[PDB]
């Protein structure tokens, strides 16, 4: 009945694929603006029951009605103000108080937006009604936003072979991704222009990352009364690149940070959407811009926005976005098609990086860290870790723990590779409380306990490591290295690995550069201790060594390395 562009027919397959094959929900990420009423409209001539079209925000149940009747169809909606026609658009809310219009068949539901679930109730009564009605209901998401640093990622499983979120992700798989770099070389995103060499810059390079990655609104906005002498630096020339642009975004680290930009720019040639700003106003701009009302919008929360305006060509990035995903989502609000659109202009005032086609790790950064790809000496798969690579190009040091890969059977079982990159003994994952298998389902002791049991020995040694240094020497059987852990306040204990025999060397991999390598899964290269010696920058020192005493000197018996606890 349709022309499907040839990645909409392969979301198509995939979701049909999918359902022919599981009862489990799955999502589809396309990037913002892909043409997704072609994918609900095939999907629909498909079903055998109606399709509900769902989404939280009014503004984006609206747009997809009005994008999918202008196909030459129809559909019903509801919102706030006809005929059942095989496709229903519907808010959260409007649907969970119309129930009893929801009764007959139902057997797709398509979440709009489905990073949004996490953000409640209303929609699991939706769920739960078609699901009571619709036992084999199959639910299929579509989100341009999988990943949000604080909340993980929305799906468990992707299909290229990667893990991604955990057992607790909502959607267990993730059935087909359209790249922005694939909608980009086919013109079928407006392509991206960023100016490389700008007037001045912020300097957040100064800033804590909490423990979710994310910066906080207080550090941010200490930070940033310190260079506002700077902001209206900023503002002056968005200004002057307005001239010869329609519509403007401005993306501002905080609400008090977007007040001030708002108070330097044309008096509403700007607007203000925050995340608490009442619906009868952020819907009053709404309609504002879309039309061209004013020049300027200024956002604080982004991933707050269905104003991705198809006219919009200047992103003003006045934040460090933390996740590459964040910096890909925000890029993205100003590539959606529009007649006269040759170019979206990227002003970047903070000092975030460049790669609109960079990888995602999925875990928080150390600020120097930039992704890097790690082979799994196991089953192969090309892992994404956090590292630091050389000026060359090649690797000192990676910080991943487990392969990510995952396969399948002959009789459905879905497993993640076992390999792990940093163990903990004979090798659950360095935060195992109990292990799967060995000391042996017993209770692992937690380094910390440890550690206080070695204090509560005045026969023991607690050291806590800030450096080691190596020496080599030889005799009768051969070659032997010995390492020297040290305080930062004068101890000593020292430790010694004969490099003669082939078991010797086994033991020396097994015991020293496996732990104590900085690249774990890339063996280090060494043929006698002056290779180890030259190799230290490849090497770490743990950062608490406990010793006892063998007979009258001190003798290594454990080192922390990885750690993480207060003591
Ligand atoms: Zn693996």
Redesign the pocket.
């Known amino acids: 009945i349709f022309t499907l562009r040839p990645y909409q027919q392969e979301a198509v397959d995939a979701t049909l694929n999918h359902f022919r094959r599981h009862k489990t929900p799955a999502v589809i990420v396309l990037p913002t603006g892909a043409g997704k009423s072609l994918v609900i409209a095939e999907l629909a001539r498909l079903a055998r029951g109606r399709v509900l079209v769902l989404a939280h925000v009014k503004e984006l149940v609206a747009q997809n009605h009005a994008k999918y009747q202008a196909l030459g169809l129809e559909a019903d909606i509801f919102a706030a103000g006809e005929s059942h026609g095989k496709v229903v658009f519907g808010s959260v809310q409007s649907v969970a108080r119309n129930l009893d219009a929801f009764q007959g068949e139902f057997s797709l539901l398509i979440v709009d937006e489905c990073h949004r679930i996490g953000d409640e109730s209303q929609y699991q009564q939706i769920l739960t009604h078609l699901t009571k009605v619709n036992p084999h209901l199959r639910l299929l998401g579509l989100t341009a936003t999988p990943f949000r640093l604080g909340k993980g990622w929305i799906y468990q499983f992707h299909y290229h072979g990667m893990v991604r979120g955990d057992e607790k992700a909502l959607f267990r798989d993730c059935i087909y991704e359209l790249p922005l770099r694939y909608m980009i070389k086919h013109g079928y995103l407006t392509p991206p222009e960023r100016l490389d060499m700008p007037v001045v810059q912020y300097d957040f390079s100064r800033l804590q990352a909490q423990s979710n990655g994310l910066f906080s609104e207080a550090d941010l906005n200490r930070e940033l009364k310190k260079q506002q002498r700077i902001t209206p630096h900023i503002i002056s020339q968005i200004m002057e690149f307005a001239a010869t642009r329609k519509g403007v975004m401005i993306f501002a680290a905080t609400v008090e940070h977007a007040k001030e930009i708002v108070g330097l720019l044309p008096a509403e040639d700007a607007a203000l959407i925050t995340g608490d700003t009442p619906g009868a106003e952020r819907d009053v701009l709404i309609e504002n811009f879309k039309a061209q009302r004013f020049r300027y919008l200024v956002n604080v929360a982004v991933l707050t926005t269905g104003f991705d305006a198809p006219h919009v060509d200047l992103i003003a990035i006045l934040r460090p976005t933390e996740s590459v995903s964040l910096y890909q989502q925000i890029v993205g609000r100003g590539l959606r098609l529009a007649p006269g659109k040759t170019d979206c202009l990227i002003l970047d005032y903070a000092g975030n990086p460049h790669d609109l086609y960079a990888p995602e790790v999925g875990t928080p950064k150390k600020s120097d860290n930039v992704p890097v790809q790690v082979f799994?000496?196991?089953?192969?798969?090309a892992?994404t870790f956090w590292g630091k690579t050389t000026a060359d190009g090649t690797l000192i040091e990676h910080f991943g723990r487990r392969?990510?890969?995952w396969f399948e059977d002959d009789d459905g079982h879905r497993e993640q590779?076992?390999?792990r990159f940093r163990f903990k003994n004979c090798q659950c994952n360095a935060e195992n409380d109990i292990a799967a298998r060995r000391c042996c389902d017993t209770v692992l002791v937690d380094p910390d306990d440890m550690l206080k049991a070695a204090l509560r020995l005045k026969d023991a040694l607690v050291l806590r490591c800030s450096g080691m240094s190596l020496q080599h020497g030889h005799d009768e059987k051969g070659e032997w290295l010995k390492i020297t852990y040290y305080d930062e306040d004068g101890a000593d204990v020292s430790e010694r690995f004969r490099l003669q025999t082939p078991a010797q060397r086994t033991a020396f991999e097994q015991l020293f550069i496996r732990p104590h390598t900085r690249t774990p899964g890339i063996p280090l290269r060494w043929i006698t201790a002056a290779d180890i010696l030259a190799q230290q920058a490849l090497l770490r020192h743990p950062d608490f060594v406990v010793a006892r005493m063998k007979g009258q000197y001190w003798q290594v018996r454990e080192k922390v390395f990885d750690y993480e606890g207060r003591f």
């Open positions: 799994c000496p196991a089953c192969g798969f892992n392969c990510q890969g590779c076992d390999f």
